[PDB]
Amino acid sequence: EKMAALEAKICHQIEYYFGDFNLPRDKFLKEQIKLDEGWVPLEIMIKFNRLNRLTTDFNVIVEALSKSKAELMEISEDKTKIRRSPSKPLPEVTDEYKNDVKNRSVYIKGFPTDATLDDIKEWLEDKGQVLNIQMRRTLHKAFKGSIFVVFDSIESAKKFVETPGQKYKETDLLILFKDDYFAK
RNA sequence: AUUUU
C-alpha cells in the first residue's frame, strides 16, 4: 500500500499538469512541448513544485508511469523525457463544452484559511471524480477559504451539491453550483 | 517562467 499510494500521487500529478484542464492554461508547459515534438525532460519536470515534493528521482518517476491506469503519458526510449501521447489530443473547446464545464462546477465555502491542496484533496477523496480544485485567493495571494471544484460528470456534481450534511469535519460548509454562487 | 510551473 503506502508505496503504491505514493506512486499513484506521482502519476496523478504528472497527468494533471498535462491534463485537459491544466495544459490549455499552462504557457510554461505549452512552450516546452513545442521544443521537441511534445517531449519534455524529466530534468525540467522535477522542477515542478508539487512533483518535486514527492520525488526528484528519474527512475522512480519512470516506474510510477510505466505502470499507469490512465495511460495518457509516454516515456521516451532513453527514459529521460516524457510527453502526452499524440494520440490523445486536447478537446475542441466549444460553447456547448465551456457551458458543460460550468454545470460541473461546484462552490464550497468553509475551509480554514490555513488548509492546503492536500487537506482539500483528502476531504474530497470519496465524493466524486474531480478534474480540478480551485483555491480562491485574495490580493495578498491568501486563501479566502472558498473554492471551486470541477467534477467529471453532472451526475456526481448534482449528487454532491444536493447532500444535506456537508460539514468540513466539525465545521459546516456552504455548497452551491458555481452558477448560483453568482446570485451575488 | 511554479495561481497544482
Residue numbers in the entry: 8 to 191
What's written in the study?
The eukaryotic La protein recognizes the 3′ poly(U) sequences of nascent RNA polymerase III transcripts to assist folding and maturation. Human La (hLa) is a 408 amino acid monomeric modular protein containing three structured domains: a La motif and two RNA recognition motifs (RRMs 1 and 2); these are followed by a largely unstructured C-terminal tail that possesses a short basic motif (SBM) and a nuclear localization signal (NLS). The LaNTD contains the La motif and RRM1, the domains required for high-affinity binding of 3′ oligo(U) RNA (Kenan, 1995; Goodier et al., 1997; Jacks et al., 2003; Alfano et al., 2004); indeed, it has been shown that the two domains must act synergistically to bind 3′ oligo(U) tails (Goodier et al., 1997; Ohndorf et al., 2001; Alfano et al., 2004; Dong et al., 2004). We have solved the crystal structures of four LaNTD:RNA complexes, each containing a different single-stranded RNA oligomer, and compared them to the structure of a previously published LaNTD:RNA complex containing partially duplex RNA.
For the sequence AUUUU, the bound RNA oligomer follows a wider turn such that U−4 rather than U−3 stacks on U−1. In this case, U−3 is flipped out and makes no specific contacts with the protein. The U−4 base stacks directly above U−1, rather than in the offset manner observed previously (Teplova et al., 2006). Moreover, because the U−1/U−4-stacked pair pack closer to the La motif (probably because the ssRNA ligand is under fewer conformational constraints than the partial duplex RNA), this now allows U−4 to make a base-specific hydrogen bond with the backbone of the La motif. Thus, atoms O2 and N3 from the U−4 pyrimidine ring are bonded to the carbonyl oxygen of N54 and the amide hydrogen of N56, respectively; moreover, the side chain of N56 makes van der Waals contacts with the U−4 base. None of these interactions were observed with the partial dsRNA ligand (Teplova et al., 2006). The LaNTD:RNA complexes involving AUUUU and AUAAUUU occur in different space groups, C222 and C2, respectively, making it difficult to distinguish the effects of the RNA sequence and the local crystallographic packing environment on the conformation of the bound RNA. Moreover, the spectrum obtained with AUUUU exhibits splitting of several resonances associated with residues in and around the binding site (32–34, 38, 55–60, and 140–145), suggestive of a slow conformational equilibrium between two states, possibly reflecting the two modes of binding observed in the crystal structures.
